[PDB]
Amino acid sequence: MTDRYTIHSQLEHLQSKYIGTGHADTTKWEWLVNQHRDSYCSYMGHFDLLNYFAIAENESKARVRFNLMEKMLQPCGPP
Amino acid sequence: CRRIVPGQFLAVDPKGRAVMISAIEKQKLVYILNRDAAARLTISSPLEAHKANTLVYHVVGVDVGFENPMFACLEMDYEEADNDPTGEAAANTQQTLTFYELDLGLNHVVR
Amino acid sequence: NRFTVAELKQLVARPDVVEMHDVTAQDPKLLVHLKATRNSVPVPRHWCFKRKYLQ
Amino acid sequence: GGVWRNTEDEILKAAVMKYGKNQWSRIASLLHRKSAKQCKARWYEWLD
Amino acid sequence: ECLEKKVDMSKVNLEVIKPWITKRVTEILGFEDDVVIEFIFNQLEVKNPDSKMMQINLTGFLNGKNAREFMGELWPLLLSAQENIAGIPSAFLEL
Amino acid sequence: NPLTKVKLINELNEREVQLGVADKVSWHSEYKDSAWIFLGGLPYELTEGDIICVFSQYGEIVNINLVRDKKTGKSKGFCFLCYEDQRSTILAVDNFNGIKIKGRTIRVDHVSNYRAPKDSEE
Amino acid sequence: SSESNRDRRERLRQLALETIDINKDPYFMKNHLGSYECKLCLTLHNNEGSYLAHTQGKKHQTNLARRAAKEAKEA
Amino acid sequence: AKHHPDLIFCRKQAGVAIGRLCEKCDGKCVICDSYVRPCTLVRICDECNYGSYQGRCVICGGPGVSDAYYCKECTIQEKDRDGCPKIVNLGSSKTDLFYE
Amino acid sequence: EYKKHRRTMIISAETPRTDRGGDSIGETPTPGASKRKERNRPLSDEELDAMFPEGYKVLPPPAGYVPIRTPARKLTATPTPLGGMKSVNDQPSGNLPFLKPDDIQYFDKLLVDVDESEEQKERKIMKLLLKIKNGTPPMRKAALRQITDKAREFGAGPLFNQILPLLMSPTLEDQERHLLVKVIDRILYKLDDLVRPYVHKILVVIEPLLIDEDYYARVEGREIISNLAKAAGLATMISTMRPDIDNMDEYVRNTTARAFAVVASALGIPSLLPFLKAVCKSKKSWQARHTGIKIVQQIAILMGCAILPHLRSLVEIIEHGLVDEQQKVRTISALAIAALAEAATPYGIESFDSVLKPLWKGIRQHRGKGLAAFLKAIGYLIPLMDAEYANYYTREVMLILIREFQSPDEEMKKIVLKVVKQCCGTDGVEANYIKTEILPPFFKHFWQHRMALDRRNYRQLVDTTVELANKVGAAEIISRIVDDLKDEAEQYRKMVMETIEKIMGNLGAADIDHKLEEQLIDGILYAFQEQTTEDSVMLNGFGTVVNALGKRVKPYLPQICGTVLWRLNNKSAKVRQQAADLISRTAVVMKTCQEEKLMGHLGVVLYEYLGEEYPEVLGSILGALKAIVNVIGMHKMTPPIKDLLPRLTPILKNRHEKVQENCIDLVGRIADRGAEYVSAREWMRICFELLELLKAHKKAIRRATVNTFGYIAKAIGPHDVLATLLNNLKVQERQNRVCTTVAIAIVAETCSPFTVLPALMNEYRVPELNVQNGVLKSLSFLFEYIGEMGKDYIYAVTPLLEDALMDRDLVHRQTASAVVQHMSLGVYGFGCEDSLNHLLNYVWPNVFETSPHVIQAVMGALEGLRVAIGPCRMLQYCLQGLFHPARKVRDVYWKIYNSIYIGSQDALIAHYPRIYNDDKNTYIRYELDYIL
Amino acid sequence: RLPPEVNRILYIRNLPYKITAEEMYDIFGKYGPIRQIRVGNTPETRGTAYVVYEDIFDAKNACDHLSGFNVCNRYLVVLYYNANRAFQKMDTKKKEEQLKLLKEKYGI
Amino acid sequence: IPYWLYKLHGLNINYNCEICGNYTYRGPKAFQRHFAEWRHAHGMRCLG
RNA sequence: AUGAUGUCAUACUUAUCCUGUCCCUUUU
RNA sequence: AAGUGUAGUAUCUGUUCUUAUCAGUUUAAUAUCUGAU
User: Which chain K residues are closer than 8 Å to C50 by Cβ?
Assistant: First the structure.
């Protein structure tokens, strides 16, 4: 397995460990996916927001919760 | 209400010995409750259970009769499908029940 | 490889905010969609200057 | 020391022009780098 | 690479691979060493080991070409043993 | 640990010299009422009379005793010597403690407790 | 020391102003940040020495001779 | 820190321990590096205080006397809810000072 | 002698293994032939050509000199007793400071004055190490900067090849070693991958820095080793540290152990777990298992609480070691188990259970130091056990402890002390049985005039006495320790005093009897009467004793007062210093006991002795006066404020450290509390005097000066204080120069800022850049100190900040960003959105900048604006920069976006605009468009 | 009865390029047998050299006696040889032959 | 011959302006000025 | 007519900083 | 006619590219750098 790719750390650089901290080489797909995931998490967080979003459809709160948790994986599309 | 911000899931074990707080992803803390000499519920330091690329669907407490307590969570892996331009690995990504045991002796959580 | 400035202006909805340095970008379509925002603030004129913005 | 810098040389020239040549302490009180002996030495050596 | 396929060291023996790995190390490393043999043995201790870390360790101990040889000798033998219903390769039955 | 005992003795002496220790508290109040000095770490090939003559430079020795083994040959490194006067014991602890002879240097201490055959340590 | 330092700085500024007046230099100008600037050299100077030292290098008087000849064609 | 930009904060998980600051650094803000307007108390890491590491100064690194607190400028800016602010590194300061 | 092995270090997996095998097969036949029957051994042509480097040629000039030197062996004996221009070359280049003769061999290449010759060019450019090591501080900083910038250019190979010998200099002083270590750290901070081949070469020089007496130097060595390990891979470091396990030199073994511990601390326990497990299972040699046990012990001691989860795994490494045949391996395993236990808080008792039974079994067959190691391990393991088994464990171990109480072994003594500290703290310890059995020997066998002399022995005895007093009782320990109060030994007296102080602080002296109280008083008196070394032991002890006695110390009050008076009449620095210290400490007890006549007499004596020239005595007198003013009231203090204020006024120019601190504290307390006896002209003179106190080399002095200026401002008025502060010409920009701005802010916080604002705005009109930057810094500090009070001054401070935002100078922009940060932090919720936007209009272009100070200020101001101006406007201003083409512009914008996203993670949903959906992507959040 | 700093090798600098090497060997032999004498054949090595005697005592005696000794027009500086610090160019190969020879000669 | 100024100021950079009457420009700022100038203005006007 | 270069001086900012220790190296 | 040290920044003085082209790295693009005529 001649790859020679040992990407762990070099000299204790900045190294953003936060999920969605953002970077310089962030492609448009990355920013869109991070934004969609953050918006889904926020919709799952705010109770009144969940009520206002699910009040549109006749589905129940659990229906919206399942539909939101299911859309977390690959919301935009395979890059 | 951040994605890495615990608060989306909170659980209490049946034995009343511990509590757990988990976010939508990339966060899991386990606080230990203990009775004091004056019956003061003292909150001990938390155990770190960071699981990267693991989205938690829900959390629940396992049944333990004064043994090593366990906490169950319906986890889903997202790191594999994050590098699948073909869109195939997005499918065949099944949620798994992860039961993490809080070893009272080791004082650390483990899968 | 690199799209033409004229092509990016023809494909853009608000090409009045197109720049010459945007043709060699990584996502010119995203840059055009962002620059035509409502309350979007632009970058300053020090992107190409050489006086350190205070000389 | 006595590096004999350029700005120090100009200051010494101005002092010899305005203050004078027979006033080494008056020039050393505005240099704060060398002594009046060193100041007069630089004046008689290079700043003459 | 051949070490890119997922394996499982729990579904195979260890004594059958001990002397083969020992001979491979004595041939590549030349001399007789106990740290390398014990390191290679403890490397396959987990139930779901990783071949990348094993290859990195072999490259650190070996030269890098002998490391590739050791990886390409240990990966397919272990894969064939894990594939065997009894849990061993074709060499364990020959002698 | 084994050779650090001489280091500890030398450090105690140096601290008493540097801390301004007086004559009444000069690491001798504890070893008083008995001049039985315990020497240890000596080599296994040391003779009794040779060690007696060596430690006799600081005065006359009253009663020396080397660690005589059951069948080994009296080669243990430990030894207990009650000298003539306690002043000689203090002088030996001050000068002869940590001296180098026959290769490996040995250590010296003041016990002043009893006549223990098995009390030292390798 | 400190007050002596302020007195020395004031005396140095006075000597520099006297030198600039004796030379009748137009370039030396006092800045709004307590500094000197040479418009002829088009440069800055932190201390009075750097402002008075704009006569050895960057002899822009030759570059001003061009404007002098452009304003008047006759020599 | 503003005085020591080459310092590395611990950023460890928070515990149930209350820390203290050295007498020489009494009152100095742990994060803001100010000298007025404290809001919240400083929480030490679990591994940041175990025996010999117990009772040390957060910023000064020396023996602590007074209990420290986070600066209000750091509390209002959502900065006090960060990891363990223990100065693990010690460099570019008090290195050659012992030689003098 | 042990460190001398470091002098025998030479520079530079299969070939190393064969070399180690050859070393062993060369170290065997030497004693082989020795039993069968040096550095000056024979030399070979290969050895000769290998010893020296290139640049030399062997040349015996004639055919007669070789056979002239061949019989030189016999020519040293028979014929030895018998009948029998202005050139020089130093090393100057342009300055090139003086190179010592020992450094002449190292910097010899620079001695050649040749110039203009590439590889030799780089080698000569690497001669800056000479200026770095030997030279002035500015040249040192310049060489450091050049090495930081020229890392990849000079190449890591030559840098290491030139730095390693300098580290091996036998004449390398402490400062030279510190500079070389700092240079190595700076080089390792930049070079990451290139440090792999030089791993062993750097470790061979860096390891001895860990094994050293200097605590700071050991910390620097540990940090450098950790950085070197984190740079390269754990596998490479493991391969480098592999052959050091079976090294003949035990010092090499200890160095490798410390290195493995540092590598585990950096790369983590489990990363080095299996390597250690393989090292422990090595049946090759006992030295291997010894090195492994030592590595485990060092890793535990360095990691502390990090061994909690892997502890069971560590037990798997340590379980097979307890059965070691060689006593050294068993002792190392016991020490490792004890380290893992004592370093671990109570947890994982089961993980150690496998080691529980044999160790106690070894206690049965314990003989010699092995018994001591087993006792230490049992003491470490006792608290980890539960009460049921702990009862039997302690009952069994106490007999062996009492039997070993008379051990002459100092190591056995320390082990017994640790076992007593661990076991006596157990709930299953019998108090009466303890006092009957362990107390008298602990007082006789443990407490001795020789044990206290040691360093570790002192702390061990203190901890043991504290634990025994807390367990069995305070009265017994007090009765045992009070007899030594008259000890001639100063160190023993200090130890007894510290023990009594710790006992009184922990248990409380209420259990002290009347006879015990009198004995303790006599002991404290004898101790204060005999104090040779200047130490806070006696002072802190007297203070704690007085605080514990309370009203019961009234009968001892007059004796203490008489002793203090006699010591004030005694030698000043020797006696009166401690006298004033005791007075300042017991002021609280003297005021509590209603020592009115005593307080007045003390005040009179203080007013009399205030004229002493000794700074050590004068400072203590000033501190005692401050304590008396703290206990005795202002109007009730017999030395009235009318005499104290003008008398303490000219004392500010004492120039001493403690004197200046005490005078500042006294003046500040008098001006903050009373603020009445000081006249207006008196306050003005005090301010004119305190203006000169800001030039000190301390920070606490500056803080006290600011506080005193604020008190004087609150007392007299704002106008005069602001006028006296406005005259700050700021000769130096450092040495508490901004301190004038801090004082202006303190006065504005104490006084009406309506008065301080326009005066500062007018003083900002001055031309001097120093004055302008000072006005900006003072405005920033004032806004930060005011906070909520700035709801009115926002519109007034807007235009000055907007004008100063024009980047005429970097310091001006830095002060502007700082003022903006303070204002945004202070205007939270007060309704200053318009001023925030007006300030951001000029603060936004400051994002493009390279100044570290300016960049930090701009980042802080952006954070403050996001806090107050809100993240919506922040993202609206930082939106276009995200997908910009450039590298620097994209970097700055990404830093701003990461700062805005670190917080406000919830509010980033709405600010995220609607980006159109591409072909293979649906980014538009259609759910947000759900119209109810 | 001497410091560890003293070693058999000694670096002699501050010499000419065409230094009379026979007289140099004679001067070095005043101490003991010259085990080796390397003359710097390089430009920077031109004017510097190293010597190595078969005994440390004689070398130290000559270092004490020949400290900055007079020359035709100069005085070469003689210092104790520093550590090697550069041996990767060399290697310990072919030592197994010497080991086998030692094991065969004595037989042990 | 300030070739330093010629390279730093952006000189010696060829540019062709078909909107500016098919003209030449020796710099990027020169190109921006030629795209928006009286010559290019008249060209666009005559071109409609 | 802005700039790049870097020995060698100069102003500035970080409320920068003077009792800091071997309390922990006790390996043979 | 007195300041100590730790990191970083700017303004001053001295020097250099009329090299016509091709390819690459790099740059937003230049520039610089690397090889050939």
Answer: 8
**Distance, CA of K14 to CA of K26 (rounded, Å):** 5
Q: How far is CA I866 from CA B95, C43, G20, J13, in A?
A: 38, 18, 50, 68
Q: Is residue A60 situated within a structural domain?
A: yes
Q: Which fold has domain E1-94?
A: PWI domain (1.20.1390)
Scanning the structure block, which residue is given the tokens 């301080």?
A: I756
Residues I290, I327 contacting (CB under 8 angstroms)? no
Structure obtained using: cryo-EM
Token pair in block for residue J98: 């010497």
Phi and psi torsions of H33, nearest 5°: 60, 30
Nearest to I169 by CA among I211, I134, I145, I217: I134
The dihedrals phi and psi of I57, each to the nearest 5 degrees, come to -145, 125
Residue A58 domain-assigned? yes
Q: Which two tokens stand for residue I617?
A: 């005595």
Q: Which domain holds residue A21?
A: 15-79
Length reported for chain B: 111
Spacing of I753 CA from L20 C1' in Å: 42
Nearest to I96 by CA among I131, I121, I138: I131
Is residue A59 a part of any domain in this protein?
Answer: yes
Q: L3 C1' – I67 CA distance, angstroms?
A: 71
H39 is in an annotated binding site: no
Q: Are H44 and H15 in contact (CB under 8 A)?
A: yes
In-domain check, residue H35:
yes
* Domains identified in chain A, total number: 1
> Pairing relation of β-strands J77-80 and J34-39?
unpaired
Choosing among C5, C9, C20, C47, which should be mutated to test the K contact, i.e. which has the most K CBs within 10 A? C20
Query: What residues of chain I, 848 to 867, have a C-beta less than 8 Å from chain C?
Result: 848-850
* I50 closest CB neighbour out of J4, J85, J90: J90
Judged on CB neighbours under 10 Å (0-12, 13-18, 19+), I238 is buried
> In this complex, do C20 and K32 lie within 8 Å of one another by their Cβ atoms?
yes
The top-level CATH class assigned to F2-122 is alpha beta
Nearest Cα neighbor of I122 from I99, I156, I94 is I156
I304: left (phi over 0), alpha (psi -120 to 50) or beta: left
Is H97 inside a domain boundary? no
Measuring CA to CA, which residue among I109, I85, I84 is closest to residue I99? I109
Size of interface G-I (CB pairs under 8 A): 28
CATH of domain J3-82: 3.30.70.330
Task: Give how far G57 is from chain I: nearest CA, Å.
Answer: 23
Indicate if the alpha-carbon torsion angle J55, J57, J58, J60 is positive or negative: positive
Q: Is residue I930 assigned to a domain?
A: no
Instruction: Give I211 CA → L23 C1' in Å.
Output: 16
Pick from F25, F119, F121: CB nearest I369: F121
Nearest to B75 by CA among B23, B34, B40: B23
On strand L, nucleotides with any atom < 7 Å from a protein CB are 1-4, 7-28
3-state secondary structure I133-145: HCCCHHHHHHHHH
* Nucleotides in M strand less than 7 A from protein CB: 1-18, 27-32
Through-space separation of residue K14 CA and nucleotide M22 C1' in angstroms: 17
Residue F11 has which token pair?
A: 């450090």
> Based on the structure, what is the number of domains in chain I?
1
For chain H, the domain total comes to 1
What distance in Å separates the CA atoms of residue I492 and residue I453, rounded to the nearest whole number? 8
Give the domain extent around H47.
8-88
**Domain assignment of residue I739, given as a range:** 95-913
Could you tell me the resolution of this structure in angstroms?
A: 4.5
I40 near J CB under 8 A:
yes
Which helix (H) or strand (E) segment is B29 a member of?
A: strand B28-34
* I100 phi and psi angles, rounded to 5 deg: -65, 160
Q: Do A78 and B85 touch (CB under 8 A)?
A: yes
What is the H or E stretch that residue I888 is in?
Answer: helix I888-902
